[PDB]
Amino acid sequence: VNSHLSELDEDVFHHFGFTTKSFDFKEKFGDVKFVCVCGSSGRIHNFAISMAKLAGLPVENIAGSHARFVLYKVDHILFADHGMGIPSALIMLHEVTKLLHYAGCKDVLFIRLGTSGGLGVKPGTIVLSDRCVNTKLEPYNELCILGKPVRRQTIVDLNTVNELKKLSENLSLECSVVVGGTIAANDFYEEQGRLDGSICTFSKEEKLAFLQSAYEHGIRNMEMEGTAITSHCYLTGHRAILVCVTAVNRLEGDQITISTDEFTLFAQRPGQLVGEYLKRNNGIIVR
Amino acid sequence: VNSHLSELDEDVFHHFGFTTKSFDFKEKFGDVKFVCVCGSSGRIHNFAISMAKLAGLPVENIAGSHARFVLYKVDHILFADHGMGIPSALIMLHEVTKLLHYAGCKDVLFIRLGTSGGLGVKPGTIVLSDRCVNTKLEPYNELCILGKPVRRQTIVDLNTVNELKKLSENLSLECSVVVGGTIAANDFYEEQGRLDGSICTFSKEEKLAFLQSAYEHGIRNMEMEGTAITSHCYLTGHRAILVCVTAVNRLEGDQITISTDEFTLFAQRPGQLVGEYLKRNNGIIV
Ligand SMILES: O=c1[nH]cc(F)c(=O)[nH]1
Numbered sequence: 001v002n003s004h005l006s007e008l009d010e011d012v013f014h015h016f017g018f019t020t021k022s023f024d025f026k027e028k029f030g031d032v033k034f035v036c037v038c039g040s041s042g043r044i045h046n047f048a049i050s051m052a053k054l055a056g057l058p059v060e061n062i063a064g065s066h067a068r069f070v071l072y073k074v075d076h077i078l079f080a081d082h083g084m085g086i087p088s089a090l091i092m093l094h095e096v097t098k099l100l101h102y103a104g105c106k107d108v109l110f111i112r113l114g115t116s117g118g119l120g121v122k123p124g125t126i127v128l129s130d131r132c133v134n135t136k137l138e139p140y141n142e143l144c145i146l147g148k149p150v151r152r153q154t155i156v157d158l159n160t161v162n163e164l165k166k167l168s169e170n171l172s173l174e175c176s177v178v179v180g181g182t183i184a185a186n187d188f189y190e191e192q193g194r195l196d197g198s199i200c201t202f203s204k205e206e207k208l209a210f211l212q213s214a215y216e217h218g219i220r221n222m223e224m225e226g227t228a229i230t231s232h233c234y235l236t237g238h239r240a241i242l243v244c245v246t247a248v249n250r251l252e253g254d255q256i257t258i259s260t261d262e263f264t265l266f267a268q269r270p271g272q273l274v275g276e277y278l279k280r281n282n283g284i285i286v287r
Numbered sequence: 288v289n290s291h292l293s294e295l296d297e298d299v300f301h302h303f304g305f306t307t308k309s310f311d312f313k314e315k316f317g318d319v320k321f322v323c324v325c326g327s328s329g330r331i332h333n334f335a336i337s338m339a340k341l342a343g344l345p346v347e348n349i350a351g352s353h354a355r356f357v358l359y360k361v362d363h364i365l366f367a368d369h370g371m372g373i374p375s376a377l378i379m380l381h382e383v384t385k386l387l388h389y390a391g392c393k394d395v396l397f398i399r400l401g402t403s404g405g406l407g408v409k410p411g412t413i414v415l416s417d418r419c420v421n422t423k424l425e426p427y428n429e430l431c432i433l434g435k436p437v438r439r440q441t442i443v444d445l446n447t448v449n450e451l452k453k454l455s456e457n458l459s460l461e462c463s464v465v466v467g468g469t470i471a472a473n474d475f476y477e478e479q480g481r482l483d484g485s486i487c488t489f490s491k492e493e494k495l496a497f498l499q500s501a502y503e504h505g506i507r508n509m510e511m512e513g514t515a516i517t518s519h520c521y522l523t524g525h526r527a528i529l530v531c532v533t534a535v536n537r538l539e540g541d542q543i544t545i546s547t548d549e550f551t552l553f554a555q556r557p558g559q560l561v562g563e564y565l566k567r568n569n570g571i572i573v
C-alpha cells in the first residue's frame with residue numbers, strides 16, 4: 001500500500017474535481033464491485049443510463065464542475081471515462097483505485113468498453129481480450145519512474161472473459177464475439193501502422209507484414225489503453241477485462257468509413273453484452 | 288508530405304467528426320496562421336471567445352457533435368483541445384496538421400496553453416518552455432512504429448519564445464513569466480515523481496533528488512505532451528511553443544491544493560499573454 005497517503009489530511013482528486021472531504025467514501029462507494037470505463041464521457045453516461053433502466057431506477061455526475069473526467073454510480077457499478085491513451089488512462093486509474101481503496105472496496109472488476117481496429121474480423125465485431133500486449137507483442141506496460149525504466153505485467157481476468165463468451169453464445173447479438181489478443185498503441189496513426197496520418201515512414205508492404213504477423217500471434221484488435229488497465233488493476237488488487245468493438249478491418253484499410261450512426265450502434269454493442277453479465281452477477285439490484 | 292494521402296478519395300478526420308468533403312478546406316481554413324491548443328475543451332472555447340471579443344467579432348464548434356475534440360476559428364487562429372498525454376495529443380496533431388495541409392497553410396505556429404507542475408517557482412507562474420524533454424531530460428519524443436523504436440527531436444520556436452518573454456515585461460500580469468525547460472511525462476503521478484498516487488515505489492528523498500536535479504538542469508515545469516507537440520510540428524513544416532501556468536510547486540508538494548476558482552484563474556494566464564501576442568501579430572483582425 002502507498003503509506004504516503006496517510007500523510008495527507010485530505011486527498012484532492014484533481015481530475016475528478018472532488019476530495020475525501022466531499023463525501024463519506026465508505027458510505028458512498030463501499031458497495032462498488034464493478035467499474036465500467038471507456039474513452040467517451042457521453043457513451044459511458046449513456047451506458048450508465050441503460051444500466052439504471054435495467055436496475056428499474058437521472059444518472060447524475062458525481063465529479064465536480066471543472067473535472068476532466070465524469071463519474072456515475074448505478075447500484076454496485078461505478079462508471080468513468082478515461083480519454084484516449086495510456087497516460088490519460090493512468091490518471092483515471094490512479095484516482096479511481098485510490099477512491100476504491102478509501103471506500104474499502106477490494107477485488108473490483110474493471111471493464112473497459114472501448115472501440116478498436118480489427119485484425120481479420122468484420123467491423124462491428126466484439127473482441128474479448130485474452131491478453132493485452134504492446135506494439136512489440138509483449139504483455140507489459142512500460143513506465144519511466146524517476147528516470148528509470150519499469151515494466152508491469154498485464155493480467156486479464158480470463159475466468160470472466162470465458163464467462164462472457166459463454167454468455168454471448170447463449171444470447172442473440174447481431175455480431176460475432178471473438179476471443180483474442182489486443183495491441184495497445186501510443187498513437188492512433190503511425191504506431192497502429194496507419195498509412196493515412198500526417199506522417200508515414202513506411203510502406204504498405206511493411207504495414208501489412210506488421211499486422212499479419214500480429215494476427216498470426218493471435219491479435220484480433222488494436223486500441224490505446226489495454227496494457228495500462230490490465231497492469232495497474234492487478235497491482236492494486238483488482239481484476240480487469242477489455243470488451244471492445246471493432247470499427248474497421250485494418251487488414252483491409254485504415255480509414256474509419258462507417259457512418260457516425262453506424263459507429264454509435266457498434267460502440268454500444270459491448271455494453272449490450274456486459275450489461276446482461278452485470279445483471280446476472282449482482283452488478284445491479286433487480287427491482 | 289505523406290504520399291499516401293493521395294491514395295484517398297476522401298479523408299475522414301475521425302476524432303474531429305468531419306471529412307475533406309465536409310468543407311472547402313482552402314476557402315475555410317486557408318488563412319490560418321496559428322493553432323492554439325490545450326487539454327480542456329471548455330478552456331480553449333473560452334479563450335477563442337476572448338479572442339473573438341478582442342477582434343470585435345458566438346464562437347461555434349466546427350467539429351462534429353459526436354467528435355472527441357472541439358474545433359473553433361477566430362480570423363487567422365484555429366482552436367482545438369487534445370486531452371491529456373502524448374498519445375491523445377498525437378491524435379490531434381495528425382488530424383489538425385492534415386487539415387492544414389489540405390487547406391494549403393504553411394509554417395503555422397502551434398501554441399499549447401497548458402497547466403503544469405512547477406519546479407522552484409510559485410504557483411500561478413507562466414513558464415515559456417525553451418526546451419521540451421522526456422523524464423530522462425532527453426530532447427526527443429519516443430515512438431514505437433511497426434514495433435521498431437523511433438526518436439524525433441523536439442524543437443521549440445525560440446524566436447517566438449523570446450518575443451513572448453519581452454512582451455510580458457511590457458504587460459501587467461499578476462504573475463512572473465519564466466523561460467525554462469519543460470519535462471513531458473507519460474503519467475500525472477508516478478512518472479512525475481508524485482508521492483500521492485495509488486502506487487508509489489520511492490521515498491520523499493528520492494522524489495526530491497530527482498526533481499532538484501532536473502531543476503539544476505534548468506527544468507522549471509512539468510506536464511504531459513510537450514515532446515509530442517514540439518517534435519511533430521517541426522517534422523510537418525510548422526513551429527511550436529509551450530505556454531504553461533504552474534498549479535503547484537512540486538519541490539514543496541504534490542497535491543493541487545489551490546481552489547477550483549484559483550486554478551481556473553491561473554489556467555487563464557497563458558491565454559492572457561498569448562492573446563496580446565496574437566493581437567499584435569496578425570492573429571486577429573481588430
Ligand atoms: O485505437 C483505436 N481505436 C479505434 C479504432 F478504430 C482504431 O483503429 N484504433
Ligand SMILES: O=c1[nH]cc(F)c(=O)[nH]1
Pocket residue numbers: 402403404405475479509510511533534535543
Ligand atoms: O501534467 C501536470 N499538469 C498539471 C500539474 F499541476 C502537474 O503537476 N502536472
